[PDB]
Each structure stands twice: as structure tokens, then as C-alpha cells.
């Protein structure tokens, strides 16, 4: 069965509600919601339709109707940010899992990430190797889209200064080695020429 | 679903005898019945589990038997304790339906009731609602029939019947019938009477009131 | 020991939502299944809803009579079980019990019984308001019948006293009857010797607690 | 409490064999079935295998059907998943969860990578533009890291941001370390890049000049 459709990312201001939808193709049953702090095992926050297990604060409330389920996080806290997955049980008695949503709480002021270009190296040119290095630093929130204009891009990682950072590596042959890198953090598009 | 019939609803017994209560099922529950006892006006209690197995807190007088479709409770000696209502519940597949229920009543000698005819209320005559009250005190067995006959014609659909529980002293019953008649209905009729059919009564004794 | 209490029971007009809470203490709430059983006054027991524990997914499911109107939820952190009813009807006037479905073994999906029951709360669905009791004398027309008729009792439980509480033997208080209009009807029966009927001052005391109204009536021969 | 611990996972060659074991404490194993959930890196959870409480039936995800078998050793309170003929993208962290997903274990890392210990190539990347400039070295084909990259043999500690490693499609991790320094100090500061490849036990020294 197709995975349950979920929004990729959701942005909510601190101390203000969060709404995540889990509309799917015939869930037909109750939808469970799971929380995953990065580097930690997922935990259950909402089971059946709107039940809450022990150890979960009251801020987590849920609903289910028709073919859509919703997690209402009233007054989200900054420490709460994680990935929220919705799961359900299909007719074939086989579990189905959703894509997931990231709670990007705007704890820090929004800023435009800084992008540094990187042309080919002399050793790579002598070795017949090309690598286009695009380093996007000081990104906020941690969600950036990297595009190459004439490619493996690492997932966003938290920086030591609390600013999201990412790197985009593009491989080109020595014969094929202008090249442009496009960065889109939040609406605005940043282009670097190399 | 699963239909659940308990037989008979009214079972009469004396103190210290043996009582059988049968719960019959539609499909085969595979020995997953639960028997409950409810004392009047109080929370029900778990009496018999997994058909035969006895639950903790119940003395040995209570036992269960049978499997598949027929299930029975056998009580060795009936104490004053345990004269209450009994229910059976199924636990094979959802939904956990309850039976009709069986009521245990203390056996007593057949005593006919006393017919008392309460005339229409003088204060309620001008209120707008006129009622006729028929009272039967000390009546045994619980089943009794009261017919509200107005002007020699039986009246139906305008009567409310109430029954008093078994008295803790004599083990009797009381029955009250209220006939609802408007002012026009009260004036239109001529002779109002109630006919009581009881096992003790040889013939239907009717008491009439004159408007 | 294991204690189950309930609240949220009161008078509600048809078609209005009401939420009952089952506070659980004395045993673990996470791994026990909770079921709600209702008893209409006079009628038999009826099973309303069942929700499994967290270990088994908490699959809520109800009887055919309340499907689409009753939703059951539970919170383990505050060990409380919720029952919410929308489109409430007059047939639902009953006493609701909170029951704990004990597993077969220590923990299993096969449930063998409802072990511990709460005391229960009264849920009344009606349209009428709080109306004071109406006292109608029933004069005695061996043992004579003297009684008072209680009519138009609204949203209540009432107390009847014979001889200001002096006469305790021979006092038969009939069960309440739901009148067509929406009020309750009650009857009191006093059996006394015919000679003593004209001597003792038969005084009936009726107290309607919800309305804070006290009514006294005198039964004398007509 | 109900606790689950899984182990037995490690880096294996493509097509190899792997057995993952779940240890269960606090709840009766025979009462509830157990699920296997895999977390591909850079992505959400995916259901892998399931077993009923009584081992009556076994549910398998279609993407893994015919390759994974799951047995519940009820005697020793353990759950086993056997993997054969693994493909490349099956790399993930496998989670062991109770039926209806109430409790999740820490998870075991399973890596399917044909790459072996390969030394990095310190290709210099100096700042070709320009008050401040960013320069550093790129470590290509590092297998498997964590590769310690230092500037000036640890002399420089401010302005050096180490980007996270990238798992390229070639199967070799790539790393890029960039040091932000003033433009006036480009011709004076000694740009030295030292790479210590712990998995390969190789210490590579590189020099960065304008």
C-alpha cells in the first residue's frame, strides 16, 4: 500500500499551535502518531484516535474523521522539535507508515544562509577529477534546497552556533570541468557563480 | 452479533435449596462466559468466570457447568446472601452482550392481595390532572394483572404501573396503578373500577368509585 | 483496595454532548482494558463500549445501539477514562458503570470478565426543568389505605415521611414512574387500623432536594 | 517497564547473511507479537516484518518478501530476523517494536557497503576569491570514517567549520573542512590540513597555500 500522505515540514512559532495532517489512501482504522528525536528511538504520543500514553504532556491532542488525522500541539515548546510520523493498519492486517513531518520551531530569528562556492582543485585537475563544492552555512530554519546550474547534497545538520548547515557535492569530468549553485532556504533563492 | 437468552427471568426458591440458571447462546462461545450478580441498587459483581472456574471472593456454593451452547449455575444451599439478580455475558467475539437477567425471589405461601381504591383527589380535581389510584398490598407471586375498566369498558394506554420490591420482613409485594384522565375524561365516565387477577384471588374482585 | 469513581453525570437536554470521567486508583491503568456498562432504570444491563490497553492498540469498538454517537478515550498519565456522547437521546437515561476488563493470563488479548465496577453515576436525558413536587391527598375511603400522590417531580430523588418520620412500619414507597410529559410520579402507602384513622394526625412530609421545596400534606377522611 | 534491546547488526558485504536478535523483558513474549521497522538514513520509518503472538501467521513487506525470515524463539524470550541476499539500499537502522508499536528498542545499525578501508585524497581547495576568505581541504573516498580533520595541526580552532560527511553514490564517504580566515592573513597563516583516518589507521598530512 502507498504510504500515508503527510506534509514534509511544518513551521510554527514558539508558544503557538501546530497542525499536522495525515490524509491517506483508505487508512480505514485508527491512526497512531509517533515522535522521533534525532538519534533516538521513536516513541508513542497518540494511539487509537486521540488517546495519550503516560509520560506525554497534555499539549498533544489528536483527532480523526473520514480519511484525515490531525495532531494538535497547543503551545509548542522549543525542546519539543522532532519528527512526527503517523501510522495506521490497512485491511490486509499489515502496518503502513507515513512519510513524516519536522516541527521547525522558530526559536531563533530567521536568517538567510551563507553560501561559499568551490571551484576544482589543482590536484583534482592534474588527477582528472572534478568536484563542485557548495557549502551553505548559517541556515535557519534547517531546511535548504540545493540546485546546480551549468550531485550529492548532505542532509542539513545543526551547527555549533545553532545555525543549520549543509554541503552539496557535484562530480564533473575533467573535460566537462560556467557552473552555478542555487540555494533555497525559505522562499528566497540564493545563486552563486563559479 | 450473538443473541443471549437467560431462562427463566423469574425464578422462585427457598432458603437452602438448589437453583439452576441457564444461559443459552447462538454460536459456540468455547467456554468464555462470565456470570454476574447484581444486588438491588448496587454495583454488579463478578461471580463465575471462564464458565467453570470460580473467581476469588465467592464461596463454594456457586458453581458453573456446561460448554458450547448450554451453561448453568448450580447453587448448593441458598443463603439470604445471593438473593439478587444474575446476568451472563459472552466473551468470544465482540460485542459483549448481556442477557435479559434472572431475578431470585424468596419462595412464600400464595397470599392474595388487598384491593384498595383511592378516589380522585379533591385538590387535584381543579388542578387539571385527575388520577385514580389502585393499591394492592401484600401480594404474592410477583406477577399480577390490573385492568382499568371505566364505565364497564376496559381502558388501555393511560395507566402507569409500579411494583414495590420484596419486603425485608415479610417478603411481600405492593402494586400501584394510576389512571390518567383529564377533567373532561374524568367527568365523562360514570363508574371507574380496577380488576385484579391474582393467583390467590378466586375471582376478579373489582372496586368501583362514584363520580 | 482498587477503587473506581465516576463523575460528569447530570441533567442534559437531548442532542447535547456530555463527557464522563472514570478516575482509576489502586492498580496500574496502562495495561488494563476499560469498558462502560449502562443500566436503564428497571431494564437489564447493557454493554456500551470497550477500549483495549496500550499494548494491544486501544481498538475502540461499541455496540450497535451507540455506534456513531459514543466515543471513548483514555489518558494513561492521569489514569482517567473518558466517554463522550453526541446526539444524546431519551432512551440513554441510565446509570453508567466503569468496568475493568481483566486479561486471561497476566496480560492477554482474550478478556474473561469485568472484575472491578465503579459505584456509577446517573445520567438523565430530559427536556423538562426542575419542578417542585405536587402533593395530592388520597383519603381513606380492617386496614385502611392512607397515602399521598407525588406528581410533577422534576430532575430528582425524593423523600417521603409518614407522621413526620414517626410511622416507619407499613410505609410502602413505590418506585418513580416517568410520566409522558416529563415529570416523575410517586406514591406512598400507609396501612393503619380503621379506628386509629380518626385519631392519629397522619402528616406526610415530602422533600424535593433539587428544587429546595418542602411540601406538607394532611390525609383526612373525605 | 517494558524494555527491548537489539544487537547482532554490523557492516556486511552485499548479498551476505545477517541475524538480528531482540531481547524482551518485563512483558510475556508469547502474549504479543513483535514488529521489525527499518529507518533508512535521511528518511522515515518503513515496516519490514511482523509475526503474530502465537506464530500462527507471518506478515512480510513486499519490498523484502522472499529474502527475510523472522522466527520468535519463545523459549529464550528472543526474536530473530534472518537476512540473506541484501541489496545496496537496505542500509538502515532496524527497530524492534511490540505489536501495535507501543515500545521501541534502541535499534541496530545494519550497513550494506562493498567498500573497504580506503585512504582519503586531500585535494586542496584554497580561497580563489578575495576582508575574510574561506579555504580548506576536501577528503574524498574516505572509508568508513570518522575522519579527524585539523587545521595547522590543531593550531587553528576558530573559523574552522567541519561539514558533515556525505555518503556518495560511489560508496565512499566524502568530507570537506573549510576554515574562515581574514584575507590579509591568507599569505601569512600556515594552512596545514592533517587528516587522521581512524578506520584505515592512516594519518595524511596536506599543505594549503595561496
For residue B131, the domain's CATH number is: 2.60.40.10
Of the candidates B209, B4, B199, which has an alpha carbon nearest to the alpha carbon of residue B96? B4
Of the candidates D95, D80, D92, D89, which has an alpha carbon nearest to the alpha carbon of residue D18? D80
Q: What are phi and psi of C55, to 5 degrees?
A: -65, -25
In chain C, the residue whose alpha carbon lies closest to the alpha carbon of B180 is: C179
Rounded to the nearest 10 degrees, how much is the dihedral formed by the CA atoms of C113, C73, C66, A29? -100
Please give the Cα distance from D134 to D208 (Å, whole number).
12
SS3 (DSSP) at B64: strand
Provide the grid cell at A62: 489528536
SS3 (DSSP) at A149: strand
CA angle C154, C156, C159 (to 5 degrees): 115
Q: What are phi and psi of D30, to 5 degrees?
A: -65, -15
Please give the Cα distance from A6 to A9 (Å, whole number).
9
Please, are residues D49 and D65 in contact by the beta-carbon 8 Å criterion?
A: no
CB contact under 8 A, D32 and C56: yes
- H or E segment and range at residue B185: helix B183-188
CB contact under 8 A, C177 and B100: no
**Residue B9 and residue B82 in one domain:** yes
Among left, alpha and beta (phi > 0; psi -120 to 50; other), residue D70 is: beta
Please give the Cα distance from C68 to C60 (Å, whole number).
12
Q: How far is CA C59 from CA A46, C28, C101, in A?
A: 13, 19, 14
B85 class by beta-carbon count within 10 Å (0-12 exposed, 13-18 middle, 19+ buried): middle
CB contact under 8 A, A124 and D123: yes
CB contact under 8 A, C108 and D27: no
C-alpha atoms less than 13 angstroms from C-alpha of D107 in its C-beta half-sphere = 22
CB contact under 8 A, A116 and D95: no
Counting one residue from chain A and one from chain C, the pairs whose CB atoms sit within 8 A come to 40
Rounded (to 5) percent helix, strand, coil in chain A: 5, 45, 50
Whether chain C has a CB inside 8 Å of the CB on A54: the answer is yes
Q: What are phi and psi of D28, to 5 degrees?
A: -65, 125
Please, are residues B157 and B165 in contact by the beta-carbon 8 Å criterion?
A: no
User: Which sequence spans correspond to the domains of chain A?
Assistant: 9-105, 114-193
**Structural domain count of chain B:** 2
In chain C, the residue whose alpha carbon lies closest to the alpha carbon of B172 is: C172
Q: What is the DSSP string of B74-104?
A: EESS--STT-SEEEEEE-SSS---B---EEE
Please give the Cα distance from B21 to B11 (Å, whole number).
8
Provide the grid cell at A138: 548559517
Of the candidates A150, A90, A158, which has an alpha carbon nearest to the alpha carbon of residue D163? A158
Report CA D108 to chain centroid distance, whole Å: 11
Counting one residue from chain B and one from chain C, the pairs whose CB atoms sit within 8 A come to 129
SS3 (DSSP) at B175: strand
Q: What technique was this entry resolved by?
A: cryo-EM
Q: How many CB atoms lie within 10 A of CB D48?
A: 23
Q: How many CB atoms lie within 10 A of CB C183?
A: 21
Of the candidates C121, C118, C102, C146, which has an alpha carbon nearest to the alpha carbon of residue C12? C121
CB contact under 8 A, B44 and C117: yes
Helix extents (H) in chain C: 194-197
Please give the Cα distance from C37 to C48 (Å, whole number).
5
> Which of C57, C105, C106 is the closest to D100 by Cβ?
C57
Choosing among 1.50.10.10, 3.90.1640.10, 2.40.50.100, 2.60.40.10, the CATH entry for A9-105 is 2.60.40.10
Q: What is the DSSP string of D86-111?
A: --GGG-EEEEEEETTS--B---EEEE
Please give the Cα distance from C114 to C101 (Å, whole number).
4
Residue intervals of chain C classified under CATH 2.60.40.10 are 128-222
Identify any residues that bridge with C3 across adjacent strands, giving them in sequence order: C25
Longest dimension (CA), chain A: 63
Question: Which residues in chain D precede a discontinuity of more than 2.5 Å between C and N?
Answer: 130
SS3 (DSSP) at D20: strand
CATH number of the C128-222 domain: 2.60.40.10
**Residue B25 and residue B98 in one domain:** yes
Provide the grid cell at B109: 405461601
Of the candidates D192, D3, D12, D201, which has an alpha carbon nearest to the alpha carbon of residue D97? D3
CB contact under 8 A, A30 and C60: yes
Per-residue DSSP letter, D137: E
CATH number of the A114-193 domain: 2.60.40.10
**Residue B96 and residue B118 in one domain:** no
Per-residue DSSP letter, A87: E
Fold matches, A9-105 and A114-193: yes
Choosing among 1.10.150.120, 3.90.550.10, 2.60.40.10, 1.20.1370.20, the CATH entry for D3-112 is 2.60.40.10
CB contact under 8 A, D99 and C54: no
Residue intervals of chain D classified under CATH 2.60.40.10 are 3-112, 121-208
Of the candidates C149, C124, C156, C115, which has an alpha carbon nearest to the alpha carbon of residue C33? C115
Domain boundary among B52, B84, B107: B107
Please, are residues B173 and B140 in contact by the beta-carbon 8 Å criterion?
A: yes
Please, are residues D19 and D111 in contact by the beta-carbon 8 Å criterion?
A: no
Provide the grid cell at C162: 409518614
- Is domain D121-208 classified as CATH 3.90.550.10? no
SS3 (DSSP) at C27: coil
Whether chain C has a CB inside 8 Å of the CB on A30: the answer is yes
CB contacts, 8 Å: C139 with chain B: 119, 122
Please, are residues D175 and D204 in contact by the beta-carbon 8 Å criterion?
A: no
CB contact under 8 A, A30 and C57: yes
CB contacts, 8 Å: D166 with chain A: 152-154, 167, 169
Please give the Cα distance from A43 to A97 (Å, whole number).
14
Of the candidates A46, A6, A45, which has an alpha carbon nearest to the alpha carbon of residue A22? A6
Among left, alpha and beta (phi > 0; psi -120 to 50; other), residue C212 is: left
Domain, as residue range, for B5 = 1-107
Please give the Cα distance from D89 to D40 (Å, whole number).
8
In chain D, the residue whose alpha carbon lies closest to the alpha carbon of A168 is: D166
Please, are residues C90 and D137 in contact by the beta-carbon 8 Å criterion?
A: no
Provide the grid cell at C168: 416507619
Please give the Cα distance from B132 to B166 (Å, whole number).
24
Provide the grid cell at C39: 443500566
Parallel, antiparallel, or unpaired: how do β-strands B10-13 and B102-106 relate?
parallel
Provide the grid cell at A173: 569530468
**Residue B11 and residue B1 in one domain:** yes
Q: How many CB atoms lie within 10 A of CB D41?
A: 11
How far away is chain C from the Cα of A101, in angstroms, using its nearest Cα? 22
Q: How many CB atoms lie within 10 A of CB D19?
A: 13
- H or E segment and range at residue D184: none
In chain D, the residue whose alpha carbon lies closest to the alpha carbon of C57 is: D100
Amino acid at each position: 500500500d502507498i504510504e500515508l500522505t503527510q506534509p514534509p515540514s511544518v513551521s510554527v512559532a514558539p508558544g503557538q499551535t501546530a497542525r499536522i495532517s495525515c490524509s491517506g489512501d483508505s487508512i480505514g482504522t485508527y491512526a497512531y502518531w509517533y515522535q522521533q528525536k534525532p538519534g533516538q528511538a521513536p516513541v508513542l504520543v497518540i494511539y487509537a484516535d486521540d488517546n495519550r500514553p503516560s509520560g506525554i504532556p497534555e499539549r498533544f491532542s489528536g483527532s480523526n474523521s473520514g480519511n484525515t488525522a490531525t495532531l494538535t500541539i497547543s503551545g509548542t515548546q522549543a525542546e519539543d522539535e522532532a519528527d512526527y510520523y503517523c501510522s495506521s493498519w490497512a485491511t490486509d492486517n499489515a502496518p503502513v507508515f507515513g512519510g513524516g513531518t519536522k516541527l521547525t520551531v522558530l526559536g531563533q530569528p530567521k536568517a538567510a544562509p551563507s553560501v561559499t562556492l568551490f571551484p576544482p582543485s589543482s590536484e583534482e585537475l592534474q588527477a582528472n577529477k572534478a568536484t563542485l563544492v557548495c557549502l551553505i552555512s548559517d541556515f535557519y530554519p534547517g531546511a535548504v534546497t540545493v540546485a546546480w546550474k551549468a550531485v550529492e547534497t548532505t542532509t542539513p545538520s545543526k551547527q555549533s552556533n545553532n545555525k543549520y548547515a549543509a554541503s552539496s557535492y557535484l562530480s564533473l569530468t575533467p573535460e566537462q570541468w560556467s557552473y552555478s549553485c542555487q540555494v533555497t532556504h525559505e522562499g528566497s533563492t540564493v545563486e552563486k557563480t563559479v | 452479533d450473538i443473541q443471549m437468552t437467560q431462562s427463566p427471568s423469574s425464578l422462585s426458591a427457598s432458603v437452602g435449596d438448589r437453583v439452576t440458571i441457564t444461559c443459552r447462546t447462538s454460536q459456540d462461545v468455547r467456554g468464555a462466559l462470565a456470570w454476574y450478580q447484581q444486588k438491588p441498587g448496587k454495583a454488579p459483581k463478578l461471580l463465575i468466570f471462564d464458565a467453570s472456574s470460580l473467581e476469588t471472593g465467592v464461596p463454594s456454593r456457586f458453581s458453573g457447568s456446561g460448554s458450547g451452547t448450554v451453561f448453568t449455575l448450580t447453587i448448593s444451599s441458598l443463603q439470604p446472601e445471593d438473593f439478587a439478580a444474575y446476568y451472563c455475558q459472552q466473551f468470544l467475539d465482540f460485542p459483549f452482550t448481556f442477557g435479559q437477567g434472572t431475578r431470585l425471589e424468596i419462595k412464600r405461601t400464595v397470599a392474595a392481595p388487598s384491593v384498595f381504591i383511592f378516589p380522585p383527589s379533591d385538590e387535584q380535581l381543579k388542578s387539571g390532572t385527575a388520577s385514580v389510584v389502585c393499591l394492592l398490598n401484600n401480594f404474592y407471586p410477583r406477577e399480577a394483572k390490573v385492568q382499568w375498566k371505566v364505565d364497564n369498558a376496559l381502558q388501555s394506554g393511560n395507566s402507569q404501573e409500579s411494583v414495590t420490591e420484596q419486603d425485608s420482613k415479610d417478603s411481600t409485594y405492593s402494586l400501584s396503578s394510576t389512571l390518567t384522565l383529564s377533567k373532561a375524561d374524568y367527568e365523562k365516565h360514570k363508574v371507574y373500577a380496577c380488576e385484579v387477577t391474582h393467583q390467590g384471588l378466586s375471582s376478579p374482585v373489582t372496586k368501583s368509585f362514584n363520580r | 483496595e482498587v477503587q473506581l469513581v465516576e463523575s460528569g453525570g447530570g441533567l442534559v437536554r437531548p442532542g447535547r454532548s456530555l463527557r464522563l470521567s472514570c478516575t482509576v486508583s489502586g492498580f496500574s491503568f496502562d495495561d488494563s482494558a476499560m469498558s462502560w456498562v449502562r443500566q436503564a432504570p428497571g431494564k437489564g444491563l447493557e454493554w456500551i463500549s470497550f477500549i483495549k490497553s496500550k499494548t494491544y492498540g486501544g481498538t475502540k469498538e461499541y455496540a450497535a445501539s451507540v455506534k456513531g454517537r459514543f466515543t471513548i478515550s483514555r489518558d494513561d498519565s492521569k489514569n482517567i477514562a473518558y466517554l463522550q456522547m453526541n446526539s444524546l437521546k431519551t432512551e440513554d437515561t441510565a446509570v453508567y458503570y466503569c468496568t475493568r476488563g481483566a486479561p486471561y493470563g497476566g496480560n492477554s488479548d482474550y478478556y474473561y470478565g469485568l472484575d472491578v465496577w465503579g459505584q456509577g453515576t446517573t445520567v438523565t436525558v430530559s427536556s423538562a426543568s426542575t419542578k417542585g413536587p405536587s402533593v395530592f391527598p388520597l383519603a381513606p375511603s380492617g386496614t385502611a389505605a392512607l397515602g399521598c400522590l407525588v406528581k410533577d417531580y422534576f430532575p430528582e430523588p425524593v423523600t417521603v415521611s409518614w407522621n413526620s418520620g414517626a410511622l416507619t412500619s407499613g410505609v410502602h414507597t413505590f418506585p418513580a414512574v416517568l410520566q409522558s410529559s416529563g415529570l416523575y410520579s410517586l406514591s406512598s402507602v400507609v396501612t393503619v387500623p380503621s379506628s386509629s384513622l380518626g385519631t392519629q394526625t397522619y402528616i406526610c412530609n415530602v422533600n424535593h432536594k433539587p428544587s429546595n421545596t418542602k411540601v406538607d400534606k394532611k390525609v383526612e377522611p373525605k
